[PDB]
RNA sequence: UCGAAGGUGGGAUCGGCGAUUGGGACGAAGUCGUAACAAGGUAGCCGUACCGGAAGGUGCGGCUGGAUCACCUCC
RNA sequence: AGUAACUGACGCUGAGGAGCGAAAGCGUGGGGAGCGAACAGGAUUAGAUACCCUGGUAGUCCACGCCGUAAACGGUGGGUA
RNA sequence: GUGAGGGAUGACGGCCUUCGGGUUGUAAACCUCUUUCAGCACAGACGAAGCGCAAGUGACGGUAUGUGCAGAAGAAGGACCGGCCAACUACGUGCCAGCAGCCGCGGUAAUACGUAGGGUCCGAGCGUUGUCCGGAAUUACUGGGCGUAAAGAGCUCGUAGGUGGUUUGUCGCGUUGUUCGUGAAAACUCACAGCUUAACUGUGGGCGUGCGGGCGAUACGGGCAGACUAGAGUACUGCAG
RNA sequence: AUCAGCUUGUUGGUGGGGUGAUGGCCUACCAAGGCGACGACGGGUAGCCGGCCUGAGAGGGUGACCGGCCACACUGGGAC
């Protein structure tokens, strides 16, 4: 059965990115929408919107490609997963691509990046890495 | 394996083979020569290797190799043996230390003297 | 201990002059022995080792002391190469030599070891003594009239005194403003090779 | 995979079965 | 001025009715020590000729490594065939910490301070290929900021920024 | 009363020796045979059963990690 | 498969455990045409405890039970996107 | 510490040789200089704002130390040199004698044995053996794998366990922030100071990755109370085997 | 687990006793519990720690000196 919706979202993104699709659709949830918000604000995806589906609602994500058709996402990794979950304090927050990437952290203040969490002095669960 | 499989069974390291079990944790042992004889090595090489049968103080009967050119070992001769393998001989893991106890340093040696128990010329 | 054997041997083997003005090295700039002419196989390890030997035979430092110096320099928060070079330069005998008071590093070491000098008002006879900021190195009054210091005090036109040092007294006082930086060191060889060798 | 490994294993197995057959009554009487 | 690194000479042979015919293969590295590198693999009946062909092949195929002052921008991990080489940037003055093949490639590429480790397939040719694959995974901060359409200060940390400043 | 040591008894469990006896490893050149690898000259191997100085043979089921299929006339 | 009427997360995997599990084999009772280990001859061979030929008993078949192995192989564990 | 400066078409001897010469080698011999440490002589501690109401009181110790005297005078060995892995020639021996960590070297011309020249690495040490970690990502949490290399149970059902779709409210168990107590000293690290330097010693921070109490947060995980139908299952109508 | 069962003051209660102190610590009676695959019960080995060595780190090995706690003082019991 489906165990990790977040990892399934990340793999849909990765598979669409490898296939040079301009479009990727998936069932909607609040957490996935928040991750889409962070990805868009950090400039990794072009734009996202949420339609409605036959049963519930869908999430639609536009993949950003450069003029010469080079992908704007180099990698997508799921860090904390069901089973082994990863939490980090405000001081040992992870670095992605030596700081060139972004780590998404679920704090009690919401979804933040590694830099935002470090600046606000908070910790939480390390959801994923984007670079 | 899965993380759950790890927490259930864990990782077991490989066991280490004990070397020179006759020494019993000592760098050297003293023994008495049960029999002093000679033997022939494995096929690719050929010589008359000099080997002594030593009964150590750890109550283990062990076959030891005699380095150097000439030796003065006979029956009932107290020797000090160390660890060291000789590739040619199949089951020899010990060498007799020259210049300790009954065994004498080699004669007319001028290089690597400390490894054969030969004093400096006066 | 100390190295007392011929000095030219090390210069010939290392391919550079370490004393500085020796004619024998110029006459034959190749390694000593029978096979000083044979072509050599090229190996990074050989180059790194020869750089370390250059460093530790220029200053007359044995291997254990050199390893202690490298550990100290690596531990410091600068960069390893110039830290090691500055630690080597801060030695008392090296300070005496660069101060123009000794023709060669060996005689500087001999003078220091014989207690001909006096740092900060207290007699010091330790060639490995390290010299800090605002250090005043003086020659004791008894040995001021000796021929070595005589010929040292009337040939003050040789190798220039580096910036971090300054001779101020007619009696050849030495003042140390600050520990030398990599720019002012003016030493042969390459520190990076030594750092690479000691990380192997 | 080479059939050499299978051959070595089968020779070992065959020899063991032969040994078991040769000492059936001795084993039964000793156990 | 070009620095060359003959990292391996191998004597290969093919069988014929008469017997064995031995040839020589040379893997060479060509670079200028300023950020440009190239790898060649030549074969001939004589070692110097094989070296020459390898050198010309390496010169023909060049590749610019994204240095930042004296090191690589960010850690990478490259894999080619079964060889796996990991690269990690180091503080200035550390020096090159790498095995013979990786050390040759990095010194030719002009990298001065870097931590590099090989984690599989000790074969020299594949280790060189994996090192080149890792060096091809590096991205300059400007390219990253262009990709995400953000100012260079927003994307890179302040640690990278002033390191470029001091080098420039 | 409890109570160390001692005595009696029947068992546990860990080792040593043992007349005889089984296999294992290695040993240029001994003896007997040709089992496998090329369709290895009966394709090979897996399980099982019987038989045979020995490798092995044969039956039943299974697998391909088995080779060859020339010429081939109408379109 | 279709309709989607109904319940409303009731799912997945599963240590151990239980069941099923080719052929050969084993027990008790039947049956037995063909085939056929073993066993007999014949031939080939230097020798044939083989290949080939002529015979041929267990077995192969049925009932009721044991066994629990296979190149039980897609040499590829199950679920999901 | 066993010396420092100067010292040549580069002495003798050794060794190699293409018989030319090269190397030991600025090394030596010689000319000066300095005496560290040892040796001799002289003086001579701190440790004791102590103890004692007696006049004195240091085991170390006449030690450390300081000042004079004489003179280079009393002071270097070990391993290794085929490749890994700095450093090669000659003679002797010949599948021997032997070496060897691995690969492997001994078959009258061995850079691998033995010995000599030379060289290299260390140096009051240098090697050998024993043991532990590293290299080993070779038990793989960081950080491995299973078609053919070792590795998918013959196949299912199912117990404990592990794990779990969308959504609302709540708890604050996990998670996270802060604060208080504790986490002896010593050790480690940073800085400073004292021994002529160093080792060593002291001082002041950090560290002591944790645990206990209070206070804050509620994204995620979990619990509690609900809701939904996309998973799962039932119903009905057909269908193939 | 190539050691799967173990326990009968053993698990709980009441009244007594005992102790500086709670308590099957002891005792009478009563009830039938208690532990165990999250490995009881057996077998082997071992003083524990601050620390030390190694390692990039995680980890691995270790418990010499110095410092803290425990245990013992020919062997085995016992109290004063």
Curated annotation (Swiss-Prot), chain A:
Gene Ontology molecular-function annotations: rRNA binding; structural constituent of ribosome
Keyword match Methyltransferase: no
UniProt keyword terms in alphabetical order: Ribonucleoprotein, Ribosomal protein, RNA-binding, rRNA-binding
UniProt entry tagged with the keyword Chloroplast: no
GO biological process: translation
Cellular compartments per GO CC: ribonucleoprotein complex; ribosome
First and last residue of the signal peptide: none
Entry similarity comment: Belongs to the universal ribosomal protein uS8 family.
HAMAP family documented for this protein: Ribosomal_uS8_B
Function: One of the primary rRNA binding proteins, it binds directly to 16S rRNA central domain where it helps coordinate assembly of the platform of the 30S subunit.
Known partners and oligomeric status: Part of the 30S ribosomal subunit. Contacts proteins S5 and S12.
Protein name, as recorded: Small ribosomal subunit protein uS8
Designated gene of the protein: rpsH
UniProtKB/Swiss-Prot annotation, chain B:
Record-level GO BP terms: translation
Pfam family, one: Ribosom_S12_S23
Entry annotated with the keyword RNA-binding: yes
Composition-biased stretches (Basic residues): 107-117
Superkingdom, taxonomy of origin: Bacteria
Endpoints of the signal sequence: none
Keywords: Methylation, Ribonucleoprotein, Ribosomal protein, RNA-binding, rRNA-binding, tRNA-binding
Gene3D superfamilies from the UniProt entry: Nucleic acid-binding proteins
Molecular function via GO: rRNA binding; structural constituent of ribosome; tRNA binding
Region (Disordered): 104-122
InterPro entries xrefs: NA-bd_OB-fold, Ribosomal_uS12, Ribosomal_uS12_bac
SUBUNIT field: Part of the 30S ribosomal subunit. Contacts proteins S8 and S17. May interact with IF1 in the 30S initiation complex.
Protein role: With S4 and S5 plays an important role in translational accuracy.
Family (UniProt): Belongs to the universal ribosomal protein uS12 family.
Name of this chain's protein: Small ribosomal subunit protein uS12
Organism: Mycolicibacterium smegmatis (strain ATCC 700084 / mc(2)155)
The encoding gene: rpsL
From Swiss-Prot, chain C:
UniProt cross-references to SMART domains, sorted A to Z: Ribosomal_S4, S4
The UniProt record lists the keyword Lipoprotein: no
Gene Ontology MF terms: rRNA binding; structural constituent of ribosome
Keywords assigned: Ribonucleoprotein, Ribosomal protein, RNA-binding, rRNA-binding
PANTHER family: 30S 40S RIBOSOMAL PROTEIN, SMALL RIBOSOMAL SUBUNIT PROTEIN US4M
Cited function: One of the primary rRNA binding proteins, it binds directly to 16S rRNA where it nucleates assembly of the body of the 30S subunit.
Descriptive protein name: Small ribosomal subunit protein uS4
The species this protein was found in: Mycolicibacterium smegmatis (strain ATCC 700084 / mc(2)155)
Gene: rpsD
UniProtKB/Swiss-Prot annotation, chain E:
Gene Ontology biological-process annotations: translation
Gene Ontology CC terms, in alphabetical order: small ribosomal subunit
Residue ranges constituting the S5 DRBM domain according to the UniProt record: 2-65
Cystine residue pairs: none
Key words, A-Z: Ribonucleoprotein, Ribosomal protein, RNA-binding, rRNA-binding
MF terms (GO), sorted A to Z: rRNA binding; structural constituent of ribosome
Role, per record: With S4 and S12 plays an important role in translational accuracy. Located at the back of the 30S subunit body where it stabilizes the conformation of the head with respect to the body.
Similarity field: Belongs to the universal ribosomal protein uS5 family.
Subunit and interaction comment: Part of the 30S ribosomal subunit. Contacts proteins S4 and S8.
Domain topic, free-text comment: The N-terminal domain interacts with the head of the 30S subunit; the C-terminal domain interacts with the body and contacts protein S4. The interaction surface between S4 and S5 is involved in control of translational fidelity.
Protein name stated in the entry: Small ribosomal subunit protein uS5
Organism: Mycolicibacterium smegmatis (strain ATCC 700084 / mc(2)155)
Parent sequence residues shown: 35 to 202 of 214
């Amino acid at each position: 059965t489906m165990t990790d919706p977040i990892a399934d979202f990340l793999t849909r993104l990765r598979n669409a990115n490898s296939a040079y699709h301009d479009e990727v659709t998936l069932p909607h949830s609040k957490l996935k929408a928040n991750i889409a918000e962070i990805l868009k604000r950090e400039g990794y995806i072009s734009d996202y919107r949420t339609e409605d589906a036959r049963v519930g609602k869908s999430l639609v994500v536009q993949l950003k490609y450069g003029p010469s058709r080079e992908r704007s996402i180099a990698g997508l990794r799921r860090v904390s997963k069901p089973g082994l979950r990863v939490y980090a304090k405000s001081t040992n927050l992870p670095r992605v691509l030596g700081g060139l990437g972004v780590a998404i952290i679920s704090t009690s203040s919401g979804l933040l990046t590694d830099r935002q969490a470090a600046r606000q002095g908070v910790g939480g669960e390390v959801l994923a890495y984007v670079w | 394996p899965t993380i759950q499989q790890l927490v259930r069974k864990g990782r077991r390291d490989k066991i280490a083979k004990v070397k020179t079990a006759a020494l019993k944790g000592s760098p050297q042992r003293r023994g008495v020569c049960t029999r002093v004889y000679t033997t022939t090595p494995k096929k690719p090489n050929s010589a008359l290797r000099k080997v002594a049968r030593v009964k150590l103080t750890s109550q283990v009967e062990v076959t030891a190799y005699i380095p150097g050119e000439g030796h003065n070992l006979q029956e009932h001769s107290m020797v000090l043996v160390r660890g060291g393998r000789v590739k040619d001989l199949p089951g020899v893991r010990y060498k007799i230390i020259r210049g300790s106890l009954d065994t004498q340093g080699v004669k007319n040696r001028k290089q690597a003297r400390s490894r054969y128990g030969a004093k400096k010329e006066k | 201990a100390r190295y007392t054997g011929p000095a030219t041997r090390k210069s010939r083997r290392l391919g550079v002059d370490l004393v500085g003005g020796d004619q024998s090295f110029e006459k034959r700039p190749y390694p000593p022995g029978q096979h000083g002419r044979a072509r050599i196989k090229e190996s990074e390890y050989r180059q790194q080792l020869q750089e370390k030997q250059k460093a530790r035979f220029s200053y007359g430092v044995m291997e254990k002391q050199f390893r202690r110096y490298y550990e100290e320099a690596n531990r410091q928060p600068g960069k390893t190469g110039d830290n090691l070079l500055r630690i080597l330069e801060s030695r008392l005998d090296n300070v005496v030599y660069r101060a123009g008071l000794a023709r060669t590093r060996r005689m500087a070491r001999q003078l220091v070891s014989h207690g001909h000098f006096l740092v900060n008002g207290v007699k010091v006879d330790i060639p490995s003594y390290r010299v800090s900021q605002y250090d005043i190195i003086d020659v004791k009054e008894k040995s001021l009239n000796t021929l070595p210091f005589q010929i040292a005090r009337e040939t003050a036109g040789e190798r220039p005194i580096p910036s971090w040092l300054q001779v101020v007294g007619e009696r050849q006082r030495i003042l140390v403003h600050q520990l030398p930086e990599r720019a002012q060191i003016d030493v042969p060889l390459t520190e990076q090779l030594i750092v690479e060798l000691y990380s192997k | 995979g080479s059939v050499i490994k299978k051959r070595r294993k089968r020779m070992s197995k065959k020899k063991h079965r032969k040994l078991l057959r040769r000492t059936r009554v001795q084993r039964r009487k000793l156990g | 001025n070009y620095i060359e690194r003959v990292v391996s000479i191998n004597r290969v042979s093919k069988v014929v009715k008469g017997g064995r015919r031995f040839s020589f293969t040379a893997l060479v590295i060509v670079g200028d020590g300023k950020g440009m590198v190239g790898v060649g693999y030549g074969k001939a009946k004589e070692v110097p000729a094989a070296i020459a062909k390898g050198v010309e092949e390496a010169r023909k195929n060049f590749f610019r490594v994204p240095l930042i002052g004296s090191t690589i921008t960010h850690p990478v991990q490259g894999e080619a065939a079964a060889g796996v080489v990991m690269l990690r940037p180091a503080s200035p003055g550390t020096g090159v910490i790498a095995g013979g093949a990786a050390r040759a490639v990095l010194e030719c590429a002009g990298v001065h301070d870097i931590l590099a480790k090989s984690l599989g397939s000790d074969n020299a040719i594949n280790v060189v290929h994996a090192t080149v694959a890792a060096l091809k995974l590096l991205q300059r901060p400007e390219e990253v900021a262009a990709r995400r359409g953000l100012p260079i200060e927003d994307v890179a940390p302040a640690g990278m920024l002033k390191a470029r400043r001091e080098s420039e």
